[PDB]
Design a protein around this ligand. Structure first.
Ligand code: CLA
Ligand code: CLA
Ligand code: CLA
Ligand code: CLA
Ligand code: CLA
Ligand code: CLA
Ligand code: CLA
Ligand code: CLA
Ligand code: CLA
Ligand SMILES: CC1=C(C/C=C(\C)CCC[C@H](C)CCC[C@@H](C)CCCC(C)C)C(=O)c2ccccc2C1=O
Ligand code: SF4
Ligand code: SF4
Lengths: 154, 730, 42, 73, 81, 138, 74
């Protein structure tokens, strides 16, 4: 739709890629497996990159010249989840890496001599402060900016 | 330390901060000690001030190498077995192009798996099993699958001898601190009783099971699993059951024979891997010696003997402390073990010892550069550890006034010479090339240094090469060809797929590389020599054995006072050797393909992988990227979308990793500190840092992460550059 | 045997049983969906 | 053991070779080296880069002078 | 300056603290009250080279010295020979 | 030399110590006591013996001849003593002077430790422009 | 046209550095904490640990994220 061309519903250049290139995968008139049970170009590796026919799903997917597909993601015509869908995903996963970073850490500096408890690991991964992340509804999006890590502690 | 003992815990030490020098890892937190711990983990200035144990550790923590080399090999025999290609390749050599490894088609993978021979998808090999494996006086895939577990057997057991040391209450002093016999044994019967033993399983079984393989068949249409006992009847084709002789001696009659051996030299027409009819004799003729030889002896005596005027008074007494060192009797060794590896690197390419090598090009140069980096990576070491001696090992100074106390006496001297040696070289050893450019780019060939312009005339010949391939006419008995087919005189006909070895001519463009080597080998050693020599004291610092052989640098004063030390002479000595070897490699293949490797057809009109481009064109040091680097490497930068591809696809990383070393090599230190805090600050605001005081790199650790990178970078680069210009044409 | 307010330790590199594995189970999602470059949802 | 380099002093009687290099690379560091005053300095950069503009025209001149008798125009 | 690198601290006590450094530092010059009462930062420094072995041990709690001297003799660098 | 042979600190050869710049300028030399014949370590790489006389070895440069201490006091003895020889006489009486053993009290001598202002907030950079009338020549 | 965009790209880069390099000399030879303070050239010093971090955070991001896209692409 935008700068490159249209998706899969038509993309001539893209078509030629499907075909030569891969199918020369062929290129081995035979190469012996008339019945034989190992050498697996034959089945998939192609067909798994291949039965990926005039279908790949359908994805929209813009495809420029040479027909390699380009990613716009400006939230329009079709392309929205090529950054946001896998974007918030990156955010959510990280941040629940470091929400617990700021956790199997803020749980130690106390009691009796706590000077490298960390070269061994008290609860592995934290396996206690663990889910605090999925057990983040809202969470730091409020309690970070109000109290605890409070401007005081700033 | 307790915890608490002595004597009066089994209760092991798991928990309580530290260990290793005594205001130790302190309660107070830090990071540096986490590269500490791994580095210098093995060392000996700490563990105890008392020899004793250490030798009781090194004879154990040794062990776990053999066992390992043993878990390794197994996954190689297994691998070289059921992940087959060996069965398929052997009925069908000259033809195949071997594999042992294969991916699994996860993610992108599979491109890496590209038809290799006896009909299957895989990644190739430049590690000549499939060719030791010619041996198998037997053949069979599941069989290698026994030699394989036979491997895991030696391991677990030759790994429970390591439990059955240090951890078990150990031997002591006398045991090694009586040395009296050690080599007696070693060389006699293993050095002997292997080579010997190897003889018995090198004509018994192997010779016959490739005496009638060098023709056709398909295995098991030959060599059963037992067949070769008392049945001395097939041994009938490959000489007598001694007929009427009885245990050599002479009252013997030959009207027509002379046992197996019947000495060869040259190369099998059909399998030019050098003859086997010999290979027994030579190993037999070894062992004997070792068998006789390992029978000296008990030790001073021999060294406590020959002195002279300027010679070595301390020659006599050349170390009580050679039963009391290690760091000494390791450093010596590495020079030999090491220097005795890259002597392999030649006798290999100019005298193959396995069936199907040379024709196999890529599966014995990989070799000649792998074996080549050890006969170098083990030598700079062979200096390091002498520096480790020269600094510390002994208790006090009980060692006195001798060969050494001598050498040191002169020291601003042995290294005073050697220096000039290098600038004489270099000027005669590199600007030599530069002439050519400056004057071939000026362009007047009349006056270059060409194999033809500066006076040398269509011949090299008359030296010693030409009195080597021609020597089977001395005290020499003989046996068609020479010793190494690459010698001047006679013969040609070598092989019927591709080629192998032939004369290999010289003059200039062989004259002067051979000389750059000199200057390269020499200034390497200058820096190690002067490095290990000035180990402990000097007139830049005399208070200079006061910590260890490392120490960053003494301090901003005296002008510089930085590099000094000898960790660092064994840091800038690596830096060269990476060249020493890296340019010796560059030499061999540009020769061995410019000439030699190439190919026969009708009228055997030879057609080298390159019609000798070398000729007038390595002499220019651009020709070294006109004819080399830019010429070959066109196969590395074309290699995408293929099967080997993993090379071109490495060749960018590792051609990156090197260009990351400079960062570690070229930089300050309180720098990444000054930086590490800006960081540490932003850290504290969110409340996320302090615990385990994050710290920059330990001046010399920084150098440790130079060098090591600069090498695994700058090296694999060619490991890729190579495997990509012998697989596929060549 | 492990109740509430942190637990028992573990070694230097259990990260080598954390790089290898966990992360390892992810090739295991990168063949179940042998492919990505956007993704359908559930 | 004599006295030389005409501006600095620590540098001036340093017996090594540093004497040289470090001479030819402290020259242009007027602010604070022996010979200086806020009056000196300023002017000592002023008639300096009047020594500038000056070298830019012996450049340009010859640029227009290897051109006019050969060097096609 | 001509050798001017500050290692000073506040204790200037010198027991299991610091001694190391070729000639340069003949101190113990007790200033009328500083605990183990020996003080300052140096003696006559026109003698020896440029270490920072100077601290390495016993505090300077601030900087620690290094080369900064510039005006640099020869007896001040091993090599006037 | 020989017609006057006055030695003390045994050695034999060596390409180590003393060369041209110890005549044409300054000299530097260490002296000492000792019990019974013992074999030592040496600056310049070598190694010899002792017994006595003056026990008076001469040394190239004075960082060199105190290192007899940095080991030559891990081998017994109060007494070791290095001076300064010229090509003519004195001023610079090197280990001579007053008391000895850098860590005692007779006098104060030099040192100071302060500059103008002390270690305190020299976020204050370089002040006046260097000008011949305000106490910055110390 | 292509050996003239660059002798103006070299230089230009070559400057910038020296620009940044005589503005870390002002801070040492000249500059005057008691004469500049609460004053907006300070505060720039004072609130500095952040400044390099929210700078370094740019790089490390702009680092591996360009380098994901280029090896992956290779
Ligand atoms: C738990 C983690 C943790 C957290 C919350 C942070 C947070 C931060 N780091 Mg950081 N960092 C960490 C660990 C962490 N780091 C480690 C281990 C290192 C290696 C020394 C660094 C090296 C580093 C540098 C050089 C920089 C930062 C910076 C930053 C800041 C910018 C974020 C960024 O873009 O960097 C992305 C994060 C990294 C590059 C860190 C990689 C390490 C992660 C993956 C730790 C993962 C958890 C770990 C396994 C803990 C074990 C779990 C335990 C509970 C069992 C931000 C405040 C930047 C800054 O100062 O600006 C404000 C600066 O550029 N970090
Ligand atoms: C199952 C058994 C076992 C146990 C419980 C121990 C326990 C101990 N051993 Mg030990 N040891 C063992 C088997 C064992 N050993 C074996 C089989 C050997 C010979 C192979 C040794 C040789 C040995 C020596 C020389 C020493 C000890 C010492 C010790 C003590 C310190 C251990 C330590 O923290 O090292 C941590 C190290 C490991 C846990 C790994 C061992 C390394 C080898 C065997 C395998 C790893 C190589 C591997 C391929 C890694 C490189 C590749 C990498 C990329 C993955 C401790 C009581 C030391 C001692 O007495 O105190 C000073 C002494 O130094 N051991
Ligand atoms: C027969 C010999 C052999 C043996 C038994 C030893 C034994 C020893 N050496 Mg030694 N050495 C050798 C050969 C040997 N060396 C050679 C050939 C060299 C020349 C390169 C050296 C240069 C050397 C130096 C400079 C030092 C020693 C030191 C030591 C001692 C410390 C050992 C230690 O803690 O591990 C150290 C090992 C590590 C910390 C592991 C790190 C390895 C990294 C660099 C990986 C290498 C790159 C590789 C491609 C990465 C793996 C793949 C990766 C990409 C996934 C120990 C007694 C040290 C000492 O202080 O003496 C008391 C001193 O540092 N050696
Ligand atoms: C347009 C210019 C401008 C001006 C007016 C100045 C003026 C000054 N700079 Mg300066 N500088 C500039 C741009 C400028 N700079 C730039 C762009 C950089 C880096 C990008 C620097 C980096 C710099 C440094 C590091 C220093 C100065 C210093 C100084 C002061 C002393 C000058 C000096 O040391 O030279 C004397 C130099 C020489 C007499 C020649 C030696 C120079 C060598 C390195 C040659 C350079 C490469 C050369 C072209 C290659 C050889 C040619 C080849 C074809 C053979 C003076 C105030 C010094 C200072 O006072 O700061 C405290 C010093 O610290 N500058
Ligand atoms: C190509 C080179 C190499 C690499 C990879 C780097 C990388 C870096 N340099 Mg650097 N540098 C280099 C050569 C290199 N330099 C050289 C030759 C010099 C001059 C001699 C410098 C001088 C320099 C300076 C002055 C600085 C840097 C800084 C940096 C960092 C800036 C942040 C960034 O760019 O993103 C982050 C890093 C990358 C994109 C590189 C890849 C790092 C990750 C992806 C490692 C990959 C993980 C891998 C899979 C695991 C393998 C490890 C092991 C387990 C096997 C970065 C780490 C700056 C800094 O400290 O920033 C805070 C700054 O201080 N460099
Ligand atoms: C070829 C290599 C190799 C071999 C044979 C060894 C062998 C040994 N290492 Mg070792 N090491 C190596 C590579 C190797 N290392 C490398 C690359 C490093 C990284 C720097 C280390 C870092 C290291 C440290 C810190 C220690 C050792 C120790 C040891 C000894 C302890 C054995 C034990 O306690 O139980 C054997 C335990 C098992 C077999 C359990 C299974 C564990 C896995 C890994 C398998 C043993 C001699 C310990 C020592 O000081 O002894 C000399 C010490 O703790 N190593
Ligand atoms: C010297 C070698 C060492 C190395 C580098 C390898 C490497 C490999 N082995 Mg292996 N292996 C080894 C020793 C080794 N092995 C030994 C001693 C044995 C006998 C126990 C095996 C038995 C073995 C089997 C059964 C398999 C491998 C497989 C593999 C491949 C799968 C990767 C993997 O292990 O994790 C993931 C890989 C190329 C796998 C393979 O070849 O399939 C592609 C197969 O699973 N190995
Ligand atoms: C040390 C070596 C190795 C080993 C383990 C053996 C072992 C054997 N050889 Mg033997 N052999 C070897 C090297 C070896 N050989 C070499 C190098 C040669 C050629 C120089 C021979 C030439 C040879 C012959 C001609 C015969 C044997 C036979 C035998 C078998 C019994 C007689 C004997 O030699 O010893 C045991 C000693 C007595 C029985 C007395 C026995 C299996 C014989 C056989 O087949 O079985 C009887 C007989 O055929 N060998
Ligand atoms: C900084 C990173 C960058 C990013 C954003 C990506 C992103 C991606 N890579 Mg990738 N890659 C990178 C650096 C990166 N890579 C680098 C540096 C390398 C070389 C080591 C690779 C080598 C690589 C391979 C071999 C593959 C990918 C694949 C992928 C895709 C699969 C993700 C997935 O399966 O999600 C599914 C699950 C969720 C979204 C949840 C994804 C689009 C895979 C692909 O299918 O091609 C596009 C393929 O396996 N990458
Ligand atoms: C770049 C550079 C640095 C900075 C380099 C650093 C700080 C490298 C150390 C980074 C470590 C390895 C990161 C470790 C963090 C992770 C191991 C923790 C998370 C665990 C994993 C799961 C990610 C120096 O310290 C240095 C010192 C001396 C000379 C030259 C240099 C030099 O060139
Ligand atoms: S020990 Fe260091 S006063 Fe103390 S810091 Fe000053 S010299 Fe002595
Ligand atoms: S720090 Fe300076 S004064 Fe002190 S000993 Fe070292 S060189 Fe001499």
């Amino acid at each position: 739709d935008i700068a490159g061309l249209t998706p899969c519903k038509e993309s001539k250049q893209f078509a030629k890629r499907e075909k030569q290139a891969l199918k020369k995968l062929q290129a081995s008139l035979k190469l012996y497996a008339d019945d034989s049970a190992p050498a697996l170009a034959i089945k998939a590796t192609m067909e798994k990159t291949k039965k990926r026919f005039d279908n790949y799903g359908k994805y929209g997917l813009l495809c420029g010249s040479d027909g390699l597909p380009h990613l716009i993601v400006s939230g329009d015509q079709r392309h929205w989840g090529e950054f946001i869908t896998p974007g918030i995903l990156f955010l959510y996963i990280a941040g629940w890496i470091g929400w617990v970073g700021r956790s199997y850490l803020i749980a130690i500096r106390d009691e009796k001599k706590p000077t490298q408890k960390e070269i061994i690991i008290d609860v592995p991964l934290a396996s206690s402060l663990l889910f605090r992340g999925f057990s983040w509804p809202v969470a730091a999006y409020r309690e970070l900016l109000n109290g605890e890590l409070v401007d005081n502690n700033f | 330390l307790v915890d608490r003992d002595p004597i009066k815990t089994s209760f092991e030490q798991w928990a309580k901060p530290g260990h290793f020098s005594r205001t130790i890892a302190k309660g107070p937190d830090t990071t540096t000690w986490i590269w500490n711990l791994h580095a210098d983990a093995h060392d000996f200035d700490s563990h105890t001030s008392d020899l004793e144990e250490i030798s009781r550790k090194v004879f154990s923590a040794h062990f776990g190498q053999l066992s390992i080399i043993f878990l390794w090999l197994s996954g190689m025999y297994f691998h070289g077995a059921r992940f087959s290609n060996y069965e398929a390749w052997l009925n069908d050599p000259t033809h195949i192009g071997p594999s042992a490894q294969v991916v699994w088609p996860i993610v992108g993978q599979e491109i890496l798996n590209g038809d290799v021979g006896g009909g299957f998808r895989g990644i190739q090999i430049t590690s000549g099993f499939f060719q030791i494996w010619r041996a198998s006086g037997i053949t069979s895939e599941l069989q290698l699958y026994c030699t394989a577990i036979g491997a895991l057997v030696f391991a677990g057991l030759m790994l429970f001898a390591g439990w059955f040391h240090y951890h078990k209450a150990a031997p002591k002093l006398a045991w090694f601190q009586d040395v009296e016999s050690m080599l007696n044994h070693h060389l006699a019967g293993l050095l002997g009783l292997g080579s010997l033993s190897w003889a018995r399983h090198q004509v018994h079984v192997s010779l016959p099971i490739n005496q009638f393989l060098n023709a056709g068949v398909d295995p098991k249409e030959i060599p059963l699993p037992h067949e070769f006992i008392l049945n001395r009847d097939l041994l009938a084709q490959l000489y007598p059951s001694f007929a009427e002789g009885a245990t050599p001696f002479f009252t013997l009659n030959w009207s027509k024979y002379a046992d197996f051996l019947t000495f060869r030299g040259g190369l099998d027409p059909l399998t030019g891997g050098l003859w086997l009819t010999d290979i027994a004799h030579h190993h037999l003729a070894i062992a004997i010696l070792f068998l006789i030889a390992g029978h000296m002896y008990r030790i001073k005596d021999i060294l406590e003997a020959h002195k002279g005027p300027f010679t070595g008074q301390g020659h006599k007494g050349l170390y009580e402390i050679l039963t009391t060192s290690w760091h000494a009797q390791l450093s010596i060794n590495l020079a030999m073990l090491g220097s005795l590896t890259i002597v392999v690197a030649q006798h290999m390419y100019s005298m193959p010892p396995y069936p199907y090598l040379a024709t196999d090009y890529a599966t014995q140069l990989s070799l000649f550069t792998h074996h080549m980096w050890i006969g170098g990576f083990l030598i700079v070491g062979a200096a390091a550890h002498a520096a480790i001696f020269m600094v510390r090992d002994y208790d006090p100074t009980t060692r006195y006034n001798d060969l050494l106390d001598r050498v040191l006496r002169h020291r601003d001297a042995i290294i005073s010479h050697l220096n000039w040696v290098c600038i004489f070289l270099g000027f005669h050893s590199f600007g030599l090339y530069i002439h050519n450019d400056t004057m071939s780019a000026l362009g007047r060939p009349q006056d270059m240094f060409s194999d033809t312009a500066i006076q040398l005339q269509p011949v090299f010949a008359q030296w010693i090469q030409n009195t080597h391939a021609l020597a089977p006419g001395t005290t020499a008995p003989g046996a068609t060809a020479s010793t190494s087919l690459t010698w001047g005189g006679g013969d040609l006909v070598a092989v019927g797929n591709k080629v192998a070895l032939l004369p290999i001519p010289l003059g200039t463009a062989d004259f002067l590389v051979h000389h750059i080597h000199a200057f390269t080998i020499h200034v390497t050693v200058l820096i190690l020599l002067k490095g290990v020599l000035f180990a402990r004291s000097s007139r830049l610092i005399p208070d200079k054995a006061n910590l260890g052989f490392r120490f960053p640098c003494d301090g901003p004063g005296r002008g510089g006072t930085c590099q000094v030390s000898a960790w660092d002479h064994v840091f800038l000595g690596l830096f060269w050797m990476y060249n020493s070897i890296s340019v010796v490699i560059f030499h061999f293949s540009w020769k061995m393909q410019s000439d030699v490797w190439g190919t026969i057809n009708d009228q055997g009109v030879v057609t080298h992988i390159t019609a000798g481009n070398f000729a007038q064109s390595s002499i220019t040091i651009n020709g070294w990227l006109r004819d080399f680097l830019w010429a070959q490497a066109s196969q590395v930068i074309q290699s995408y979308g293929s099967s080997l591809s993993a090379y071109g696809l490495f060749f960018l990383g590792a051609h990156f990793v090197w260009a990351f070393s400079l960062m570690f090599l070229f930089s300050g230190r309180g720098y990444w500190q000054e930086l590490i805090e800006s960081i540490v600050w932003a850290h504290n605001k969110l409340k996320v840092a302090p615990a385990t005081q994050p710290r920059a790199l330990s001046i010399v650790q920084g150098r440790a992460v130079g060098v090591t990178h600069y090498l695994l970078g700058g090296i694999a680069t060619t490991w890729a550059f190579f495997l990509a210009r012998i697989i596929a044409v060549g | 045997m492990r109740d509430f307010k942190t637990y028992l330790s573990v070694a230097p590199v259990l990260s080598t049983l954390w790089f290898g594995s966990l992360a390892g189970l992810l090739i295991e999602i990168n063949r179940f969906f042998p492919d990505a470059l956007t993704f359908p949802f559930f | 053991a004599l006295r030389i380099p005409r501006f600095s002093q620590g540098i001036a009687q340093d017996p090594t070779t540093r004497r040289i290099w470090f001479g030819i690379a402290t020259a242009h560091d007027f602010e604070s080296h022996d010979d200086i005053t806020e009056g000196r300095l300023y002017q000592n950069i002023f008639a300096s880069h009047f020594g500038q503009l000056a070298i830019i025209f012996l450049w340009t001149s010859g640029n227009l002078f290897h051109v006019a008798w050969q060097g096609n125009f | 300056m001509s050798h001017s690198v500050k290692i000073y601290d506040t204790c200037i006590g010198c027991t299991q603290c610091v001694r190391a450094c070729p000639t340069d530092v003949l101190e113990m010059i007790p200033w009328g009250g500083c605990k183990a009462k020996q003080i300052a930062s140096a003696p006559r420094t026109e003698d020896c080279v440029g270490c920072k072995r100077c601290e390495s041990a016993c505090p300077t709690d601030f900087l620690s010295v290094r080369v900064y001297l510039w005006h640099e003799t020869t007896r001040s660098m091993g090599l006037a020979y | 030399e020989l017609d006057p042979n006055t030695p003390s600190p045994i050695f034999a050869g060596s390409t180590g110590g003393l060369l041209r710049k110890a005549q044409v300028e300054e000299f530097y030399v260490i002296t000492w006591e000792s019990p019974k014949e013992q074999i030592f370590e040496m600056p310049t790489g070598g190694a010899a013996i002792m017994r006595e006389g003056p026990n008076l070895l001469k040394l190239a440069r004075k960082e060199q001849c105190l290192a007899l201490g940095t080991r030559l006091r891990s081998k017994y003895k109060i007494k070791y003593q290095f001076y300064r020889v010229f090509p003519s006489g004195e001023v610079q009486y090197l280990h001579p002077k007053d008391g000895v053993y850098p860590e005692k009290v007779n006098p104060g001598r030099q040192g100071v430790g302060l500059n103008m202002r002390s270690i305190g907030k020299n976020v204050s950079p370089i002040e006046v422009k260097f000008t011949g009338k305000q106490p910055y020549d110390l | 046209q292509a050996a003239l965009y660059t002798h103006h790209q070299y230089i230009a880069g070559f400057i910038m550095t020296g620009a940044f390099a005589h503005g870390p000399i002002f801070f040492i030879r000249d500059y005057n904490p008691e004469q500049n303070a609460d004053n907006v050239l300070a505060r720039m010093l004072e609130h500095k640990e952040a400044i390099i971090s929210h700078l370094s955070w740019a790089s490390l991001f702009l680092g591996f994220h360009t380098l994901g896209l280029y090896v992956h692409n290779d």
